[PDB]
Amino acid sequence: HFRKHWQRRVRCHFDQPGKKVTRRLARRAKAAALAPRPVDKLRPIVRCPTVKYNRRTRLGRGFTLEELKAAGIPRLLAPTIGIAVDHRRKNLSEESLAANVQRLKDYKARLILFPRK
Amino acid sequence: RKAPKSDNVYLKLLVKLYRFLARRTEAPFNKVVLRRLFMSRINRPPVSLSRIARNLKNGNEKKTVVVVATVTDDNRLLQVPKMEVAALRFTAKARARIEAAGGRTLTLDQLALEKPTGANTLLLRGPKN
Amino acid sequence: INNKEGLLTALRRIQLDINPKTTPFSFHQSVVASKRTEDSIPQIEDDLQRELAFMNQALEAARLGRSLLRKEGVPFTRPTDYFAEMVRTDATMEKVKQKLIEEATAKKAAAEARKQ
RNA sequence: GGUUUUGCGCGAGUGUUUGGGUGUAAAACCCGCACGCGUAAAGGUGAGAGCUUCGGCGCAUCAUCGACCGAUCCUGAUGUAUUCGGAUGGAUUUGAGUAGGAGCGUUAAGCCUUGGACCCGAAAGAUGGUGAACAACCAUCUAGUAGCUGGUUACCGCCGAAGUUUCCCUCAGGAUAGCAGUGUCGACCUUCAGUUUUAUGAGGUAA
RNA sequence: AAGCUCCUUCGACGAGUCGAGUAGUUUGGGAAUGCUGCUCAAAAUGGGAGGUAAAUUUCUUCUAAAGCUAAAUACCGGCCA
């Protein structure tokens, strides 16, 4: 499979450790900007779509509005205190709702919220 | 032959030991062990615990199993009998399952000291291809 | 399910009269083979035996239809003076002549190369 | 990117290096979930290395008789929702099937395919420009490609050929076997032999 | 000025655009894979795309024809190291 001019389109990766250093320094810069805050936002537990991966779960995009309302977190405050919100996802069942609500109250139990001024 | 193809220095130590034995004793066992020590890895296929468990059946349960290869664990074998095996290498699960059953694990130099001529031994080869 | 009497009565609701004593052969133009076409084919997978069995059934049909049309007097033989349009365009028959002549010269070139 | 062999680690598993952590900072060290490949979803008899308490036990492998399965050929059970099912006895059955796993990763060497592809060597064709004055030149695609030449870099040692059988089809050719070599298995002067002898074949051919 | 709650009140969502026929071009891709040109030219419990032999198109999942937006990505050039 070398029918085309592959010489002009070879990508080497001699900058792999340098890019790893760059990524770690970017994370350090994020830490410097957000000093007591975590560098990541909280994300829900979701089930993998297909039948092949139905058994396992992973991290989602953001919490459903029903999950936030059931956990006692208002919708507008949630992105400002480190929680990700996804308006597209639906719960569709009482078992993902309970799991992500438990995740949200676990996050609330370990949060140090500071006053505005 | 004249030299083993292996670069393992302990393999060459075993080759020197069994050269001496084959020369200074009239035991065909030592000559066969030396010949198999000269042989390559593909010519020394792994012998599983189940194949030894089959061959340890009639009156050989009191004999010492000699394998010039690596004994591997077999998951198909549910119960491991008591066995005294002398081999080049043992995998971790195979050695653990042999010692957990009350059996024992040997190297070839301990065999050469305990059984210099191979009396009451059971020479076993792994399946070809 | 097989509600058989339902299929018979639905056929009766939609049957036309097919009786050789009442309607002529040209009306239906339908002939049914006597052989059931399951004994002539031992296994399904071989194409040659299945195709020759279908050939046998259609040849039986063609013979009996030709005999009945000869009894009827309805014209059967398409004559050479009758020119009509074709089922597929004459480009397609140019192509099929082209492959026949191509394999003909391929076979004769192989034979000539074996002679040479 | 395939394939054969030697070494090595682990082994029914194997592969840390996409990435994350860490660092004395392109090194070294560590690994959370995946993913790739592989594995999963014991019979008789006879030889046979080796062992033997001399009674025998018998590796790997081979031969032979058997066993089981995907599926195929009939016989067509209890049963069946009443139109579904296959129980028993039989087959010259197959398989890249089972019958106590061998693979994964890496290194070294050899071979094959594609990239400029061991080095140098057409006529061409295309794109975009420069000039004239009755197609030419320039740069690039382009290290274009086809055949066919020329050339292809120290020493010593050991082993060493063929220029043929058969098959198929392009003509512009490959495959198979042969000659040379390597590994494994089985015996081991048992056995083997471009040979004589004995019997034997076509020549009773000469005499 | 702002967020939330409640409800004997309301809730406007992009047209020579979808789509049909046809000619090119392109793609692994005739539900034309996408795009474009010509002719015709929509809807409102609507429209698009999928699932399904399962008894009829049951069900599922989104809203086109207006627009903005950092990061992870590329880099034979620029200022350097």
From TrEMBL, chain A:
The keyword Zinc-finger does not apply. The keyword ATP-binding does not apply. GO terms for biological process: translation. Keywords: Ribonucleoprotein, Ribosomal protein. GO terms for cellular component: cytosolic large ribosomal subunit. One of its GO terms (molecular function) is RNA binding. It comes from the Eukaryota. Belongs to the eukaryotic ribosomal protein eL13 family. This is 60S ribosomal protein L13. The chain holds residues 13 to 129 of 213 of the full protein.
TrEMBL record, chain B:
Keywords: Ribonucleoprotein, Ribosomal protein. GO terms for molecular function: RNA binding; structural constituent of ribosome. Residues 1-129 form the Large ribosomal subunit protein uL15/eL18 domain. GO terms for biological process: translation. One of its GO terms (cellular component) is cytosolic large ribosomal subunit. Belongs to the eukaryotic ribosomal protein eL18 family. This is Ribosomal protein L18-like protein. The lineage of its organism: Eukaryota, Fungi, Dikarya, Ascomycota, Pezizomycotina. The chain holds residues 44 to 172 of 213 of the full protein.
TrEMBL record, chain C:
It comes from the Eukaryota. It is found in: Nucleus, Nucleolus. Transmembrane segments: none annotated. Belongs to the EBP2 family. This is rRNA processing protein. It comes from Chaetomium thermophilum (strain DSM 1495 / CBS 144.50 / IMI 039719) (Thermochaetoides thermophila).
